[PDB]
Ligand binder design. Sequence first.
Ligand SMILES: [Cl-]
Length: 258
Amino acid sequence: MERYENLFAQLNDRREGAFVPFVTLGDPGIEQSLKIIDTLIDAGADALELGVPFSDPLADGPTIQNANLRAFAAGVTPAQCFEMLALIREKHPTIPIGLLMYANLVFNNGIDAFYARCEQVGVDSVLVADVPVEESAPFRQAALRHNIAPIFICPPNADDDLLRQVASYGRGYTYLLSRALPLHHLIEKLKEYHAAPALQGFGISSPEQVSAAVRAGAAGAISGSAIVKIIEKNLASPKQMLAELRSFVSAMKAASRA
Ligand SMILES: [Cl-]
């Protein structure tokens, strides 16, 4: 539906980098998560990265692990996630919506049915976070068959062979992890290979990292856990939670004008 392409063109009009918050769907409840998402959007978030609750405790830090646990504790299911996604899309028809999920979710009712459901509720992209590039073809093909952008992660030491693959396979945005190779080198090579615009997603905790990412030439930044941390720290006070989210997103967008 051109949502990412149009966003990045309009960000170019604005001379801005994209700011893309991550949150877990249903954290800390269905209605609160819907309103957190409306608040992020109203405060200036350029696109959304939305997680279907998963479990990766050996690797995740406490912020992302606890958010998954809060969502499951609220009784969140994938079905409710897809209904939330449909509602967010109906209320906000133009914002790019990227799903982040883990492979276990799809190996329940099948790869094609998963991407069909994404297409049906209006998701724009899907990152299957724990699938090696070497095994990605069934996911990539299913995504393209259902008009979904498959998101590939560019790791920090990518050689040119891999950069060529990531550039060719992905659509919408490239999920870049770079603080191993210099940040500006990965960015330049991805542009050389006509990759989807790069969003720096490593360590995007506060305005300084957003500013560094845009100054290095990235098209924007994804905040993988900083929004979730504000949710966790303000659980007892929804009003203050939403106020702190609003000042956070405002500060991250200020940094994206650097
Ligand atoms: Cl994440």
